[PDB]
Design a binder for this molecule. Structure first.
Ligand SMILES: Cn1nc(-c2ccc3c(c2)OCO3)cc1C(=O)O
Ligand SMILES: Cn1nc(-c2ccc3c(c2)OCO3)cc1C(=O)O
Ligand SMILES: [Cl-]
Ligand SMILES: [Cl-]
Lengths: 134, 138
């Protein structure tokens, strides 16, 4: 449970956003990526796994997961494979879109808002969950 | 203490790496950025602050911190601006460099290895940051 994430893609302004949610806490990491390719997906998963203890990722099982680069990345990082945040995040992105030149900045502001919003925030919940596991 | 990070720049292969260390645990976040400019620095700080409780960042106070964009990002996120690892990290990057087509990939494998390495026993930096922050929460 504390090691379980769900990864989804969302599309805005021509670009692709990957959103990983830590299922037990609702905490999110999200990035705008150039294209929904195996190489970018692998890179996103490598970054996530270096930052938080990722044991299993639930994905949409689509084309960007079938290639050798993504497979090698999950294997290397030790990851196994196996929208109630999403409109909220879209909404937050809409709320802040005007204050940033670039979509990637608005996405990161929305991540900040989502994870900090508060009895506990998603940021407090993920730490409490993982600490409890340790 | 739990909210204190140090941010430094490292240069390799013509590119700039920013490395943020969480001072009490040794946990790191690091990225290769296109140039050491205020816009990229601000964006790096926004990202970091959305993921971990960042209260204060100790920097080198250089040119990329003096501009409007960085100051507005720190203000917005509620952040005040008040060699060892960085060589071990450089070494881990060298160790993995040939397995990565791109430097950015090697940097993130080095981040993974640094944060997960259990130096005996007996906690990793990743375990230590979570333990420190949860303690503070309670
Ligand atoms: C509500 N709140 N949430 C956080 C917060 C945000 C992100 C995190 C985290 C705590 O631990 C891991 O990642 C900080 C605050 C605060 O200082 O008020
Ligand atoms: C050594 N090790 N440390 C962790 C670990 C634990 C808690 C964390 C983290 C990494 O990053 C943020 O919070 C996971 C493992 C592992 O089982 O490989
Ligand atoms: Cl996807
Ligand atoms: Cl710097």
């Amino acid at each position: 449970s504390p090691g379980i994430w769900q990864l989804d893609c969302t599309h805005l302004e021509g670009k692709v956003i990957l959103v990983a949610v830590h299922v037990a806490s609702g905490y999110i990491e999200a990035e705008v990526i150039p294209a929904e390719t195996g190489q970018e997906t692998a890179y996103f998963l490598l970054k996530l796994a270096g930052r938080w203890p990722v044991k299993t990722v639930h994905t949409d099982n689509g084309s960007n997961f079938t290639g050798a680069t993504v497979r090698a990345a999950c294997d290397w990082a030790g990851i196994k494979q196996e929208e109630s945040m999403n409109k909220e995040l879209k909404k937050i992105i809409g709320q802040v879109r005007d204050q940033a030149e670039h979509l990637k900045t608005a996405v990161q502001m929305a991540v900040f808002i989502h994870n900090h919003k508060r009895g506990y925030s998603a940021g407090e919940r993920i730490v409490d969950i993982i600490a409890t596991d340790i």
